Amino acid sequence: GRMHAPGKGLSQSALPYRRSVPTWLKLTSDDVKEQIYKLAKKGLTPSQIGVILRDSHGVAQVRFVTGNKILRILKSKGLAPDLPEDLYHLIKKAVAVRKHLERNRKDKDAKFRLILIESRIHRLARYYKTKRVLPPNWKYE
Partner 1 sequence: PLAKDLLHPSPEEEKRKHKKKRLVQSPNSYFMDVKCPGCYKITTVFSHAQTVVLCVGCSTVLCQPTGGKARLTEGCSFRRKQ
24's contact among partner 1, RNA, none, with CB below 5 to 8 A by partner kind, is partner 1
HEC letters along 3-30: CCCCCCCCCCCCCCCCCCCCCCCCCCHH
Amino acid occupying residue 8:
K
123's contact among partner 1, RNA, none, with CB below 5 to 8 A by partner kind, is RNA
Centre a 10 Å sphere on the Cβ of residue 111 and count the other Cβ atoms it contains.
14
**78 is an interface residue for RNA by CB under 7 A:** no
Q: How far apart are CA 20 and CA 1, in angstroms?
A: 33
Residue 43 φ/ψ region, left for φ over 0, alpha for ψ in the -120 to 50 degree band, beta for the rest? left
50's contact among RNA, partner 1, none, with CB below 5 to 8 A by partner kind, is RNA
**40 is an interface residue for RNA by CB under 7 A:** no
Min dist CB 92 to RNA, Å, is 8
Which residue, 70, 81, 86, 67, is CA-closest to 37? 70
**1 is an interface residue for RNA by CB under 7 A:** yes
Which residue, 6, 63, 4, 57, is CA-closest to 27? 57
**56 is an interface residue for partner 1 by CB under 8 A:** yes
**60 is an interface residue for partner 1 by CB under 8 A:** yes
State which of positions 8-37 bind partner 1 (CB under 8 A): 10, 12-17, 22-24
Single residue of 28, 51, 76, 130 touching partner 1 by CB under 8 A: 51
**137 is an interface residue for RNA by CB under 7 A:** no
